[PDB]
Each structure stands twice: as C-alpha cells, then as structure tokens.
Amino acid sequence: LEQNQEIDYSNYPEFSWDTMPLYMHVRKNTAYTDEEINYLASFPLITLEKSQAQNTYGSTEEGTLATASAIKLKNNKAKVLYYRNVVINWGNYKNDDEFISKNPSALLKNQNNELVYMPNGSTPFFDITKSFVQEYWLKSVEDMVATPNIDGTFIDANIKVLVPSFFSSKVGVNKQAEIENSYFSMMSRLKESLSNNLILANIIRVRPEFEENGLEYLGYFNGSYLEGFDSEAFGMSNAEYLVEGIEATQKAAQSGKIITMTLGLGEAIDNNTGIDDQREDVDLNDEELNKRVDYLLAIFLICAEKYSYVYLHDGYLATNSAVWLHQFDQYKKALGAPLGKAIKNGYIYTRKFENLDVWLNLETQTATLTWK
Template sequence: MKLNSIFKIRFLFVVSLVFIFFSCSNNEESKEDPEVIDEEVITELTISDGTVFEPKGFYPKFNWEVTPQYCMFGDGTRTLTASEVSLISEKSDFICIEKNHAWIALNYAEVGTKYEVEAFKQVKPDIKVLYYFNSAYAWPFTSYNENFTTDKIDDYPELKKFLIVNEDTGELEHRNNIFFFDVLNPDFRNWWVETVVAGVTFSGADGVFIDQMHGFSWLRNDRAEEVRLAMGEMMSSLKEGLGENKILLGNNAATVEDVFPVIDATMFEHYSKTITNSKENLLKEWDDMLRIAKAGKISVYRFGVEVEDDASIDGLSGSEKEMALEQLSKERLEYYHACYLIGAQPYAYFQYGWGWRLATGPLVDYPELEKPLGSPKGMYSRTTSTGWEFTREFEHASVWVNTETEEAKITWKYIVS
C-alpha cells in the first residue's frame, strides 16, 4: 500500500507538470495571435500585431497624444522667422530642411540648414532635424554642387564624369537643365558619400533625407541590375560614413531591397492619384508599414493635394492658386488623414500639404491633426474580404475609409474644448 501510494503521488506529479506545460504553451500562442491584442498591455510602442516596436536611441520622441507629424519644407529666398520656428516646433519633433532653403539669402543650402538647425535646437533641443540631398539629380544649391550647371560644368571635367551621358547624342542627360548623377561610376559614389557626410556634419543635422532611389535605371535597362546593386552599396557606405547616431531616411525606399536593410526610415511619397494613391497601392502600403515597424524603422506617410486634378484650381496662378490649394487641402484632409490612420504604426508619421515649399502647408493650421488621438487598439479591419472599406479604432477616435470612393469619416470620441 505504501509503495502504491508513492507511485500514485509520482504519477499525479507528472500529470500536473504536463498540464502546466501545455497550459503555458497555449497561453504563449494566444499572445502571438495577431488578431488578439490585450488592451490592458497596449503601450505607445505596441505594433498592430501585438509585438513591440524597438526604437533606436537617436530616433525622435514618439507618442499618440495627437497625430504624429513630420514636416519638410524650404524657402529658397530666406530663413525662417522666430514665430515660424516656434509654430513648426509645436507641430513636430521630426523635420527636414528642403534642398534649396535660404539658398539666395545665405549663398548655399547647407548654410541654410545649419542656420535652422541652430534655431530649432534653441527652441526644442530634442527635435530631430534632417539635411536634404539627392542621389539622382545634381541640384546646384549647395557649395558641393554649385558647379553642376550648364555654364560651369565644362570647366570641371572631374565633376562632369559623374554625370550620365546620352548614348545617342553624347550630351549630358538633364531635366530642365538639372543634370543626372551616374551611380554606376564608383568614383562618383565615393564623392557622393563624402559630400553628404560633409553636409550633415557641417549643418549639425541629426541625419539626412535622401531623395530618389532609382539611379535612372530606365535610361539603361540592360544594366538595371548593376544600378540596383550600386545604389545599395552607395547607401550602405553612406550609413557607415554617417555613423550609428544619425538618421538615414530614404524616399520611397520601403521596397528597394538593397537599400531598405541599411536605412533607418522611409517615406511613402504619394505623388500620383492613379499610381501611388490607388486603392491597391494604399492597401499594400499598410502592410509595408507593419513590416517597417517590425524591423524597427520609421515611416513617413506623405500626402499632397497638388496631385489632384480639381476644377477649383483650373486657370489659377500665383497667390490665387495657393489660396485655392490651401482650401482644397482642408477639404480633403479627412480622407488622407484616415488613409494614414488605418495603417499607422509606432514611429509612423503623417506629412500633409500641397508641395515642398514653406508656403505649401507647414504653416497652415489643421485643427484635426491636434485633436486627442490615443493609441490604436489593434490592426485595421476590412469590412468584406474583397471590399475597399476599412475601419480602425483608436483610444479617442474611430476611423472609417472607403479607398474606392475616396470617402472617409473620423469620429472623435473626446475633444478638448
């Protein structure tokens, strides 16, 4: 009897261990279910699949108190006023100074960026300010690029060899007299990396926005693979040259396979109503935003109403056109805002306006972007498996959008009076 009791005790002990093991396994599986997120444990950095975003120490601050905004702007004629610096600082912790800022006033764009970096840091020390440089177009606004012009380039053969030549005409390729960099030239790639690093260092910026990821591959389709590899190599070298504590943001780089692994951030630039703004592409981008967040990288979701073909701006020019575009931007904000919110993840920022200049949105008051938002409660829902209506819940907002009809409704649950 005593022996039997010992066996019974051991048997029950083993059964208990097995039960505990399988219970723990089942609990672990439920935590990983992307459709189930425990609202008790949602934080500012909870990704929509229930995992947690892991930011790098040099990233900007992020929260869901209001819509997280990224601002990118420039004015080629002047620097910002103190009130403009203050206004933009209140909107965003993450900004970029555009390619020709203060070029006329201060001679060179990198000087304009340096000026604004110092101005913004005085008002908001933790703000992250990016320098701008292009990997494809030789914009002549910096001291590094000032000789890439039609009247000077022939005097600088060492620079001319960095540019793409038309195989049929022997002339330099250009768009409105802006020359094209040749990423296939290894000497150019070395010069370019050194130049960008020099601009970031001189300006004191927290990183750089690199525009154009294509390398003009369509001009030499037979060498497209070489172009792709060269662009990846150049961006990898740039990240190494910048160092670990600088942000590298690549425009439209979410799906550029050799570039994406080395960058810290990417922008979705919506420049075409039929291509980038199509319902199919928007759906794809929401999945991309999830993938980017899981990789610990930043997203910028940029919309601009200048892509609209709207009768309200037909025949207008100058200030009249700008006023009409501002009004149009206010009318269309809810739809574009909803498109961002449906797919937004931690460290996904919204940029809005109707251009890249200071006067095309960054100084406009959009009260909806300052309404209390709160953390998302999970991923978006698609109302039917093949339909184009989507919904998503935030702590203080319910979002509905139809990307086929371009309609949206954001219902705010709590509004500060």
C-alpha cells in the same frame, strides 16, 4: 539584398500618440522668419529640402546650417534631416557646382558619350559608378550630418536607381546595372557611417518591379518617406493601388521603421486662381476640404505605428503652400494609442484608438473620424 539591422531607438525622434504625429518637409528660397522657425521646431521630424534658403545664405549648404541651428535653439529635441539626392545633380549646392565644374567626367553619359538629363533637359545626373563621384557624394553627406544641428539624411531617388527602365532607357542595360551596384555600395557605406544618426529614404512605393513594394530595400535605412501613395498607375485602380501601399506601410511600421507619409491636398485646395490673378485665400475650415483631410488622415491612421508621422501638404515650398504655418483641427484633438490593428473588409478599413474611431472606404474615397 541588405538585411535589416536590429532595432535601436536611441537616435529616433520624439513620438507620442496623444495627438496626430506630424512630419515637416520644407524649403524656402530665403531665411525663415522667427515665427516660421518656431513652427518648424514644433514638429518632431523635419526634412530640409534642396534649395534651402540659398538666396539669403548663398548656397543650400549654408542655408541648411543656419536653418538647423535656429530650429535647434528653439527646440533641441526636433530631429532635422538633410536632403540628398543619390543621382540627380539639382542646383544650388555650392560644393556640387564647384565639383562638377572642376570634374566634368563626374556626370552620367549614354553609350554614345552624350550627357543625359531629367525632363527639363538641363538637370544632369551624377555617374555614381565612378569611384571619385562616390567618394565626393558620401563625404558631402557625412560632413553635413556630422555638424551639430543635423541628425541624419533623407536619401532621394532610390527608386530611379532601382526601377531598371528609368536608367536603362537613358544609358542602356549594363550601365543601369552598374549604377545599381554602386548605389548598394554607397548605401552600405552610409548605413555604417551614419549608424549613430538617422537615414530616411524615399523607397516604399507600389511598383510592378518591386515584389515587396520597397520593403525589400529597407535594410539600409531607419525608415521610409512615402509619396505617390494615392496616385495609381500600372492599370491598377485607385483602391487596388492603395491596398498594396497600405499593406507595405503596415508591415514596415510594425517592423519598427520610421514612416513619413506625405499626401497631397493640392487638388482639394486649388480653386482655379493664382496663375494670372491673385490666388484666392483658402478657407481651411471649409467643410469639403475637411472631409478630404479626414480621408487622408484615415489612410495614415490605418497604417500608423510608433514612429509614423504624416504631412498633408500643398507642395514643399513654404511660400507657395496654403497650409504653411497652419494646423487643421484634426491635429489638435486627442488621438491616443491604437487599441488594435486595422481591420480590412474589402476596400473598407476600420481602426480603434483610445480617443478615436476610424472608418475608411477606398472605393468611395471617404472616411469618418469619430473623436471621443
């Protein structure tokens, strides 16, 4: 497996321990307002998702360029990443639509010559085993990253390539191995061509198939995004699953890799409204909600090192998120640099920072943040 490169922080985002280090990961179907641009520009690291303002700019490619230009004019130090899925042919990319229309052989088929799909039955996959698909995809990423207001790329669906059953159950064992081989070739190409830029990947993940829960695959990347971090599977308890995720994240962060930890608040915010009635306004000062914020931040702080950033989210679509444009009080309070590593005692973790003491219990799913 690809080894990690020697650490060079030249192109890394800004980072401070003074207050919570925050990540943003976002789309909107139309252009951001000026106020929204100012909000985005306040984050040190921003990923622009697929379906980026396409109903204003006609395409994600153009909506990305316009959004990134506006962010950079407000804060030229904000780092902006372009999302790219390595295998799923999601909609709203004008260049992808043209490429697939002109070249139907670019899509992935099973051994019976049938197109295979995501669970919606309509979104297909790129057959990255084909040279011309690899070249198209790599060029699309390199061309976008080369533009002035884009600093790097967020690579998605690595785990769909690397967990053998995902594609072997669709296209067979040999084709899965071929997809994997081509994936490694493509990531090696980006590691070299984007060496003066940033590459983040959705890669660290508790998986029975991954002996090191994704750390073994970080060699191509400046860091990992984390999702599914508190969503247990494989018969593991919630606490057991988080213990493994925390260990992997601590190791990656201590190695100097960027970490962008996403944790959902959707379940703590939902109040059984919004489907056939107005969605009830969320009291973002609610005491129980803030206990959940404390808990999720405590998980993050037990792991964090320099270049670790957190996003407690209500989905990535700005217009459907109750936390969009908002900042919890925990994000404004003095944090300060760690005074050492977390201490683990069973499912209880503690950590001291210059202005904060953290206590976390994974079994009870509770935490305390004692600000100084």
